[PDB]
Design an enzyme around this catalytic site. Structure first.
Site, PDB file in Angstrom:
ATOM      1  N   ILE A  29       0.828  -1.186   0.000  1.00  0.00           N
ATOM      2  CA  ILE A  29       0.000   0.000   0.000  1.00  0.00           C
ATOM      3  C   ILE A  29       0.868   1.242   0.000  1.00  0.00           C
ATOM      4  CG2 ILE A  29      -2.326  -0.773   0.448  1.00  0.00           C
ATOM      5  CD1 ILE A  29      -1.980  -1.325   3.077  1.00  0.00           C
ATOM      6  N   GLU A  34       4.836   3.242   1.651  1.00  0.00           N
ATOM      7  CA  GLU A  34       5.903   3.322   2.634  1.00  0.00           C
ATOM      8  C   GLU A  34       5.473   4.280   3.704  1.00  0.00           C
ATOM      9  OE1 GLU A  34       8.313   2.704  -0.391  1.00  0.00           O
ATOM     10  OE2 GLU A  34       8.598   4.732  -1.179  1.00  0.00           O
ATOM     11  N   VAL A  39       7.803  -0.441   5.059  1.00  0.00           N
ATOM     12  CA  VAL A  39       6.768  -0.673   4.062  1.00  0.00           C
ATOM     13  C   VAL A  39       5.486  -1.169   4.755  1.00  0.00           C
ATOM     14  CG1 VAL A  39       7.575  -3.009   3.507  1.00  0.00           C
ATOM     15  CG2 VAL A  39       6.256  -1.679   1.794  1.00  0.00           C
ATOM     16  N   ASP A  99       2.232  12.823  15.068  1.00  0.00           N
ATOM     17  CA  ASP A  99       2.470  12.923  13.621  1.00  0.00           C
ATOM     18  C   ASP A  99       1.195  12.740  12.768  1.00  0.00           C
ATOM     19  OD1 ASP A  99       3.933  13.363  11.293  1.00  0.00           O
ATOM     20  OD2 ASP A  99       4.535  11.287  11.062  1.00  0.00           O
TER      21      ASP A  99
HETATM   22  N1  LIG Z   1      -3.686   5.288  -0.879  1.00  0.00           N
HETATM   23  S1  LIG Z   1      -5.054   4.609  -0.646  1.00  0.00           S
HETATM   24  O1  LIG Z   1      -6.062   5.535  -0.460  1.00  0.00           O
HETATM   25  O2  LIG Z   1      -5.366   3.728  -1.684  1.00  0.00           O
HETATM   26  C1  LIG Z   1      -4.931   3.649   0.832  1.00  0.00           C
HETATM   27  C2  LIG Z   1      -4.572   4.258   2.043  1.00  0.00           C
HETATM   28  C3  LIG Z   1      -4.485   3.493   3.205  1.00  0.00           C
HETATM   29  C4  LIG Z   1      -4.727   2.107   3.148  1.00  0.00           C
HETATM   30  N2  LIG Z   1      -4.663   1.351   4.269  1.00  0.00           N
HETATM   31  C5  LIG Z   1      -3.771   1.618   5.272  1.00  0.00           C
HETATM   32  C6  LIG Z   1      -2.589   2.349   5.035  1.00  0.00           C
HETATM   33  C7  LIG Z   1      -1.721   2.583   6.120  1.00  0.00           C
HETATM   34  N3  LIG Z   1      -0.528   3.247   5.957  1.00  0.00           N
HETATM   35  C8  LIG Z   1      -0.313   4.220   4.894  1.00  0.00           C
HETATM   36  C9  LIG Z   1       0.857   5.075   5.378  1.00  0.00           C
HETATM   37  C10 LIG Z   1       1.302   6.012   4.259  1.00  0.00           C
HETATM   38  C11 LIG Z   1       1.738   5.190   3.049  1.00  0.00           C
HETATM   39  C12 LIG Z   1       0.570   4.334   2.567  1.00  0.00           C
HETATM   40  C13 LIG Z   1       0.127   3.398   3.688  1.00  0.00           C
HETATM   41  N4  LIG Z   1      -2.038   2.087   7.336  1.00  0.00           N
HETATM   42  C14 LIG Z   1      -3.160   1.347   7.494  1.00  0.00           C
HETATM   43  N5  LIG Z   1      -3.647   0.797   8.602  1.00  0.00           N
HETATM   44  C15 LIG Z   1      -4.828   0.201   8.260  1.00  0.00           C
HETATM   45  N6  LIG Z   1      -5.029   0.422   6.942  1.00  0.00           N
HETATM   46  N7  LIG Z   1      -4.006   1.149   6.507  1.00  0.00           N
HETATM   47  C16 LIG Z   1      -5.090   1.512   1.938  1.00  0.00           C
HETATM   48  C17 LIG Z   1      -5.187   2.284   0.785  1.00  0.00           C
END
Ligand SMILES: NS(=O)(=O)c1ccc(Nc2cc(NC3CCCCC3)nc3ncnn23)cc1
Length: 292
Positions: free
Chosen positions: A10, A12, A17, A121
């Site tokens: 999804i 970084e 990651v 953050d």
């Molecule tokens: N970019 S997107 O809208 O398609 C997207 C955003 C977040 C997630 N899911 C996600 C993403 C995430 N971390 C993001 C941090 C910044 C880089 C992308 C992942 N932590 C999470 N905890 C639970 N779900 N989740 C899935 C798709």
């Protein structure tokens, strides 16, 4: 790790990651986060987070401490607020939906703050949405566990855009007020469809805050001139009206935003007090238009 099939990167995060993954046994769909290599205090801090459960906090399902390596398993959400805002840009997110999201994020903050846990953050990328109209905070508490870096593992620059002024001025002791500042920044961004303070270095960040809110002085912020990175030589800009800063936000929203963006962290509104602000009198919970 090997109890999980990776579905897709999804992206970084601050620490490593992040993958969408499926539990090979139960079939649960999760966000699998590998943490950059652990210290016993991190382990114990992270374990505290497992109890810190709230509907507006992305649920920490498991900490896997094996192979001298660190994995966090979270509830999976399909979209973040940055993507949703970008997708909503021609018209902007409707105001009732902004209000609902703000109200729910303040409930998540009020919960964690009452247990003395800060995020530190907040940013659109860690605010996560579902089809039911919920919004949730991701990575709560990890900053105290692992310490916010200048760049990520892949050299990406960590945003300064939502950083509170007391952090930028070098205060070592953060309060829950730093979260209210960030959320206020994010509030303004949803309304205007532009970041409030898009700094590209610490001094640019500070000077952008100063140009909008006025250079802080001893009147508005007792103790400011004695903070580590305060310089008597800072230029002295005047404050601008919020009427000019966040059109077309109404008087209730502008009032609330002012209190969330107070320079003095002791005067800044708490999450709990903010939930009682007249801005939320007519709050509702709309369904967002989500394309997955
Ligand atoms: N970019 S997107 O809208 O398609 C997207 C955003 C977040 C997630 N899911 C996600 C993403 C995430 N971390 C993001 C941090 C910044 C880089 C992308 C992942 N932590 C999470 N905890 C639970 N779900 N989740 C899935 C798709």
């Amino acid at each position: 790790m090997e109890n999980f099939q990776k579905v897709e990167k999804i992206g970084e995060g601050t620490y490593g990651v992040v993958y969408k993954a499926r539990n090979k046994l139960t079939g649960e769909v999760v966000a699998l986060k590998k943490i950059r290599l652990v210290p016993s205090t991190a382990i114990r801090e992270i374990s505290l987070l497992k109890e810190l459960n709230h509907p507006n906090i992305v649920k920490l399902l498991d900490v896997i401490h094996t192979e001298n390596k660190l994995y966090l398993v979270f509830e999976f959400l399909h979209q973040d607020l940055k993507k949703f805002m970008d997708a909503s840009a021609l018209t902007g997110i409707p105001l009732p939906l902004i209000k609902s999201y703000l109200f729910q994020l303040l409930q998540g903050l009020a919960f964690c703050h009452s247990h003395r846990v800060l995020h530190r953050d907040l940013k659109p990328q860690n605010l996560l949405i579902n089809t039911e109209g919920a919004i949730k905070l991701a990575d709560f508490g990890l900053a105290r566990a692992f310490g916010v870096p200048v760049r990520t593992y892949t050299h990406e620059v960590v945003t300064l855009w939502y950083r509170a002024p007391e952090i930028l001025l070098g205060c070592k002791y953060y309060s829950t007020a730093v979260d209210i500042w960030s959320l206020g920044c994010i509030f303004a961004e949803m309304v205007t469809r532009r970041a409030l303070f898009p700094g590209d270095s610490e001094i640019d960040q500070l000077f952008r805050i100063f140009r909008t809110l006025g250079t802080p002085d001893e009147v508005v912020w007792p103790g400011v001139t004695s903070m580590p990175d305060y310089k008597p030589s800072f230029p002295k800009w005047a404050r601008q009206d919020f009427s000019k800063v966040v059109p077309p936000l109404d008087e209730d929203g502008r009032s609330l935003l002012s209190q969330m963006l107070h320079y003095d962290p002791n005067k800044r509104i708490s999450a709990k007090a903010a939930l009682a602000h007249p801005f939320f009198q007519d709050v509702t919970k709309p369904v967002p238009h989500l394309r997955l």
